[PDB]
Design an enzyme around this catalytic site. Structure first.
Site, mmCIF file in Angstrom:
data_model
loop_
_atom_site.group_PDB
_atom_site.id
_atom_site.type_symbol
_atom_site.label_atom_id
_atom_site.label_comp_id
_atom_site.label_asym_id
_atom_site.label_seq_id
_atom_site.Cartn_x
_atom_site.Cartn_y
_atom_site.Cartn_z
ATOM 1 N N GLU A 49 38.272 123.977 64.280
ATOM 2 C CA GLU A 49 39.463 123.227 64.024
ATOM 3 C C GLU A 49 40.148 123.844 63.042
ATOM 4 O O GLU A 49 39.647 124.308 62.001
ATOM 5 C CB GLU A 49 39.100 121.565 63.577
ATOM 6 C CG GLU A 49 40.246 120.676 64.115
ATOM 7 C CD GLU A 49 40.034 120.880 65.748
ATOM 8 O OE1 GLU A 49 38.822 120.473 66.055
ATOM 9 O OE2 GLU A 49 41.400 120.834 66.282
ATOM 10 N N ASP A 60 45.998 114.859 54.292
ATOM 11 C CA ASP A 60 44.951 115.905 53.620
ATOM 12 C C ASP A 60 44.357 115.401 52.491
ATOM 13 O O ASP A 60 44.872 115.079 51.524
ATOM 14 C CB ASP A 60 45.266 117.407 53.340
ATOM 15 C CG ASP A 60 45.889 118.166 54.660
ATOM 16 O OD1 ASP A 60 46.050 117.483 55.752
ATOM 17 O OD2 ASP A 60 46.478 119.165 54.748
ATOM 18 N N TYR A 175 38.514 112.499 68.174
ATOM 19 C CA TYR A 175 38.389 112.571 67.144
ATOM 20 C C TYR A 175 37.731 111.127 66.301
ATOM 21 O O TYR A 175 38.624 110.249 66.133
ATOM 22 C CB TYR A 175 39.553 113.262 66.063
ATOM 23 C CG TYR A 175 39.144 113.692 64.736
ATOM 24 C CD1 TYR A 175 38.510 112.823 63.858
ATOM 25 C CD2 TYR A 175 39.367 115.045 64.303
ATOM 26 C CE1 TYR A 175 38.416 113.259 62.366
ATOM 27 C CE2 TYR A 175 38.934 115.389 63.337
ATOM 28 C CZ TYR A 175 38.587 114.689 62.306
ATOM 29 O OH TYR A 175 38.370 115.102 60.887
HETATM 30 O O1 IGP Z 1 37.367 117.408 55.575
HETATM 31 P P1 IGP Z 1 36.143 116.369 56.133
HETATM 32 O O2 IGP Z 1 35.748 115.214 55.355
HETATM 33 O O3 IGP Z 1 34.888 117.038 56.472
HETATM 34 O O4 IGP Z 1 36.899 115.937 57.364
HETATM 35 C C1 IGP Z 1 37.459 116.893 58.260
HETATM 36 C C2 IGP Z 1 39.243 116.854 57.859
HETATM 37 O O5 IGP Z 1 39.346 117.379 56.612
HETATM 38 C C3 IGP Z 1 39.684 117.824 58.915
HETATM 39 O O6 IGP Z 1 39.375 117.454 60.262
HETATM 40 C C4 IGP Z 1 41.252 117.490 58.566
HETATM 41 C C5 IGP Z 1 42.207 118.264 57.737
HETATM 42 N N1 IGP Z 1 43.302 117.674 57.792
HETATM 43 C C6 IGP Z 1 43.215 116.399 58.497
HETATM 44 C C7 IGP Z 1 44.353 115.416 58.715
HETATM 45 C C8 IGP Z 1 43.865 114.233 59.631
HETATM 46 C C9 IGP Z 1 42.688 114.304 60.042
HETATM 47 C C10 IGP Z 1 41.739 115.226 59.791
HETATM 48 C C11 IGP Z 1 42.204 116.227 59.107
#
Ligand code: IGP
Ligand code: IGP
Ligand code: PLP
Ligand code: PLP
EC number: 4.2.1.20
Lengths: 254, 394, 394, 254
Positions: A49, A60, A175
């Site tokens: 990803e 973010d 997701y």
């Molecule tokens: O960092 P985490 O808690 O492990 O979750 C992944 C998430 O940051 C990555 O999938 C992601 C980065 N930016 C995003 C924006 C919206 C949804 C999801 C995301």
């Protein structure tokens, strides 16, 4: 879409869940980001990803926000990211690659032209973080025309109508934002296989996600912290990433 | 599915992460309910009148137009409590938060003006207010930081990311995504995702309603044009709304031209930027060729915003309203002109609107015209800025 | 010989050098003429309403009185144009200057607030304004000096004598003794020689007239007491005048007690000074044992005056009004209380009036009482003063 | 009053006008002020006009304002001034002495008690600068009870009623602010003899005042400037004062 179908069929034959890391393309520099990505894959990532740095990434979290800032300090642009994506696909023919995008970088030169460039470099799915299902029509249509899976987030505050839409419109994987009830309804509605994401930073959460009926788990801040903590020792950064990814991936196996 | 249309032609929408959709839908339904509730309407009218000082005056400025055929009035939002029009809609949104059973307000602020507005309404209505602010803005806006904390708001300095306004926003929305059952996100302009552009217009539209009644009383006819500055677009949509269907009335919106459009250092996306998607909406914005949001600039911090509300983009597209720009130096001249000739010190944001009415008058001094400028705020807050510039030029 | 009585009991008079008597008599006759002229009255009402924003609100403050039997309203002179009640009477005196055929205004200012008021009225009404200011005050009141010059007034720094306010006054009166045919001396409070105490009361008495109509509308009865701060006495006489003959209504005037009456560092001559003759009038003043005028002190520059208007001394003498004092620390607490609980930042002068209403409420929380405080001005101008004190105490 | 009557009778027998300097008591220190005053008299002053420093002297011009400030820097008080006045009278039995006062220093411990103290030390007249004729009743009554002349200013903006009041109420001399018409009406109304004051700084203005029908002239800022310019050389200060006063006095002689 084909790469995700092939991977989930293979993992299910092995009674295994998927382990999918997230990293920001270009963090902390193009060369080091390419080496990080090849290490993630060599250590057992099932899919990737990948974020394209954007100036105003309102979804973010702070770890990721700092990953964008390092990439911008190295001068990374979307065009450079697409060049990296082409080389990553040229090295790894089957791993599913999904992008995490903000709507302006998709809309910027034409939504159709963005999904055409993704198809050209070998991307398999796109999640646009600030497009809810209510606004997704032009994005999901362009994605399907270019054989790209449109990814939707299924949040903890989802209702039945949302579940049905996400099941119907999404492809590749669903997701699932960190879940048994949501997971069971998604399968009832024939949704794309679920990947649990948010806060996944240890082996026991990968196995719990698979035991709950998810097809796997995504981990991004835990991976990005290893980068952030080892900027001064790139060798050590890669060795720590290898250790973390092989432990997370081992948790998914039968 | 929404109750109201989220778009104005192509512009607007709800471009937020899925997890914030229930908060937006909840807000829209609360607002539609409120607008039909005579008690909500009576409570809002009561605070507007007895707390904030509405109606505001409509002042004819004869000294400034002497020797011309222009008659100019100024809608006195500078006399509203807090010194700017921002107070009107934060009272309305605080009441909506209470209608939804919420006791907490979330806000973000760069310049500090929307923060002060949110903190004063929250103090009055018994709401706990937390205001996110980039650590760099905290450092530079000491006076406004101190007003907010005097009024009981928690000012939370944001160090994440680049420690600026966009980072205060991200944190504010992240908080809101977890706490929307008990907290309301008070957006400070007529932009962002639906239903904010609509709610902010309807809770600022008394500026134009009053202006209509006042100009009909004093002149017996409607204005040839109403003129207002445009950052995100709340004071201008507030003045224009009630005149939209009066097709003889010109609607002129003034964006900041900063050091000059040709320099790139300006805040005029509606006319000089390009449509994009950011901050929850599809709208004109200042962007790089590969879609990164560019930095805006204006001598006036209140107009220093790189996008514009979607209803403005729509009204421009159809030709119902016209949008222009005014540079820093033209705004500074209008500021000095108003102080010397009418004894009113205008906000530098409002000075952009006044500068354009002065150009309409001076360019064609024998055209008979009746103009209203929205004097969105007072300029005591701008005296050091003006003083140090003029001192620097000697 | 005068048309009106120059004294209030023993207090008042016209203690000026003989050469200024014709200017005073001219002014009194112009004022008596004006008060009977429906056109003058209509012009003054027009500027008050459409320029300055009258009537001002009367705000009920429920949050501050919660848990007590006090109902408290604040008369919102802080929402008047310029942010203080001073604007009302400088518009009236500018109109009188024009009625006498004068095109120039003379004023003196220490703190700079009366200077700004005089410069804004003069800008509006086409008058050339020259404001005398001790060089030491010029140095310390940069913001107000810059507002006056933005509005076109000539700020004349006085270096003669001790280069303070009393020296600006002497120069201003000397000028006025030579130029009274073409210039009017705009006195900024309800003190000095007749007819100034009378004119300033009559041109501030709309504060109490409005308050009466507004409280009768909202509560159906008059206040148990109206409370106002007292420097020279203009905002308090403005609030009290229309209630003088309503004998059930208490009239409470609050002088500054500075660091505490016992310290000698205060501005409370009415209750703690002694009758003397200075500034053209017989009135209570702060003086040494051999008759030199003493220096006054208050945290609030607007209340830092060593005497009081003669009508106040008279009303106290007969027991119709009562006068108290409030210290710096009590004023600072009322300032913080209003910001936090009502979202209104009050001037530190007005905070003395509010501090006394809060003491009336807190000392006897089960007495049923309806109180009105005159919130004479807004306190954005006091945020650095308050900030540096509180920072100093940690 | 007697001293002024005696002096104007004697000067009129000599067809001479009076020359009257003004100085602030105590400027620039008590001792130096006593020496200045004895020099003014030795040089030909006919009478003296003496100010008692006050904190808020709104009618004093800038030269005089600075004389008050020097006296306050030397710690001069009204009590010290009365001590000086007693010694000046003890040295000079016939010269008329008039004070220039501000109303608060007269009112301070009782208007009657102020004129009683003036009588006790030998003062002959008092001019209260901020008391117009309209407010003078208690001052002029107390003055006459203690055989002190109440002095009134006759300004350039005087009208007929003012002239009549000044003529009727004043004694000693009439202070004529710088004049033929005013002078002639004052004599018609039997006013106290006029002394022209304000701006008198040269010999030709003394002779012009006497030619216009005034009984003399007062000079204060010109005298006070000589003090102010010679603070560092007290000897030179006295020699310059002697020169100036004998030239001004010579202009008054027939
Ligand atoms: O960092 P985490 O808690 O492990 O979750 C992944 C998430 O940051 C990555 O999938 C992601 C980065 N930016 C995003 C924006 C919206 C949804 C999801 C995301
Ligand atoms: O200084 P001049 O211009 O020579 O005028 C004498 C005047 O100063 C002296 O008589 C005086 C000092 N203070 C006053 C106050 C009022 C009237 C007169 C005076
Ligand atoms: C904040 C502000 C503006 C700009 O915002 P809009 O939403 O465009 O009105 C304009 N004027 C004043 C005085 C302001 O405070
Ligand atoms: C000047 C001022 C005062 C003091 O003067 P008054 O003549 O006594 O009213 C009080 N409050 C405010 C806000 C002022 O500006």
């Amino acid at each position: 879409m084909e790469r995700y179908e092939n991977l989930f069929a293979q993992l299910n034959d092995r009674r295994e869940g998927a382990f999918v890391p997230f990293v920001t393309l270009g963090d902390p520099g193009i060369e080091q980001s390419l080496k990080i990505i090849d290490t993630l894959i060599d250590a057992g990532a099932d899919a990737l990803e990948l974020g394209v740095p954007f100036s105003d990434p309102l979804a973010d979290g702070p770890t990721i926000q700092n990953a964008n800032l390092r990439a911008f300090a190295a001068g990374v642009t979307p065009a450079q990211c697409f060049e990296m994506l082409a080389l990553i696909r040229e090295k790894h023919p089957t791993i599913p690659i999904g992008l995490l995008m903000y709507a302006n970088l998709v809309f910027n030169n034409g939504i159709d032209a963005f999904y055409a460039r993704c198809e050209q470099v070998g991307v398999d799915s796109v999640l646009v973080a600030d497009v809810p299902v209510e606004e997704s029509a032009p994005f999901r249509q362009a994605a399907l025309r270019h054989n790209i899976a449109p990814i939707f987030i299924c949040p903890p505050n989802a209702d039945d109508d949302l579940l049905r839409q996400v099941a119907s419109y999404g492809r590749g994987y669903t997701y699932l934002l960190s879940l048994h009830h949501l997971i069971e309804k998604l399968k009832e509605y024939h949704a794309a296989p679920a990947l649990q994401g948010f806060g996944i930073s240890s082996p026991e959460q990968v196995s719990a996600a698979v035991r709950a009926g998810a097809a796997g788990a995504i981990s991004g801040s835990a991976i990005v912290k290893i980068i952030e903590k080892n900027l001064a020792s790139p060798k050590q950064m890669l060795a720590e990433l290898r250790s973390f990814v092989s432990a997370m991936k081992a948790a998914s196996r039968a | 599915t929404t109750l109201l249309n989220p778009y104005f032609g192509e512009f607007g929408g709800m471009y937020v992460p899925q997890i914030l959709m229930p908060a937006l839908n909840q807000l829209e339904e609360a607002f539609v309910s409120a607008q039909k509730d005579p008690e909500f309407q009576a409570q809002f009218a009561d605070l507007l009148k007895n707390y904030a000082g509405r109606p505001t005056a409509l002042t004819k400025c004869q000294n400034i137009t002497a020797g011309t055929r222009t008659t100019l009035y100024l809608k006195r939002e500078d006399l509203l409590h807090g010194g700017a029009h921002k107070t009107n809609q934060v009272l309305g949104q605080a009441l909506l938060a209470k209608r939804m059973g919420k006791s907490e307000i979330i806000a973000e602020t760069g310049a500090g003006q929307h923060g002060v507005a949110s903190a004063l309404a929250s103090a009055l209505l018994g709401l706990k207010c937390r205001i996110y602010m980039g650590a760099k803005d905290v450092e530079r806006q000491s006076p406004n930081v101190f007003r907010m904390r005097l009024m009981g708001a928690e000012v939370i300095p944001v160090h994440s990311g680049s420690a600026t306004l966009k980072d205060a926003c991200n944190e504010a929305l992240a908080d809101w995504s977890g706490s929307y059952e008990t907290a309301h996100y008070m957006l400070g302009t007529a932009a962002g995702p639906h239903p904010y552009p609509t709610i902010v217009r309807e809770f600022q539209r008394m500026i134009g309603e009053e202006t209509k009644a006042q100009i009909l009383d004093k002149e017996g006819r409607l204005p040839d044009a109403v003129i207002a500055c445009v950052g995100g677009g709340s004071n201008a949509i507030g003045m224009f709304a009630d005149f939209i269907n009066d097709t003889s009335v010109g609607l002129i919106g003034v964006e900041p031209g900063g050091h000059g459009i040709e320099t790139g250092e300006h805040g005029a996306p509606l006319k000089h930027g390009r449509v994009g998607i950011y901050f929850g909406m599809k709208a004109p914005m200042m962007q790089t060729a590969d879609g990164q949001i560019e930095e805006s600039y204006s001598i006036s911090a209140g107009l220093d915003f790189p996008s514009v509300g979607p209803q403005h983009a729509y009204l421009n597209s159809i030709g119902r309203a016209d949008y222009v720009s005014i540079t820093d130096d033209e705004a500074l001249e209008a500021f000095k002109t108003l102080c010397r000739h009418e004894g009113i010190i205008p906000a530098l944001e409002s000075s952009h609107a006044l500068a354009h009415a002065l150009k309409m008058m001076r360019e064609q001094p024998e055209k008979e015209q009746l103009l209203v400028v929205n004097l969105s705020g007072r300029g005591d807050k701008d005296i050091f800025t003006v003083h140090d510039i003029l001192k620097a030029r000697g």
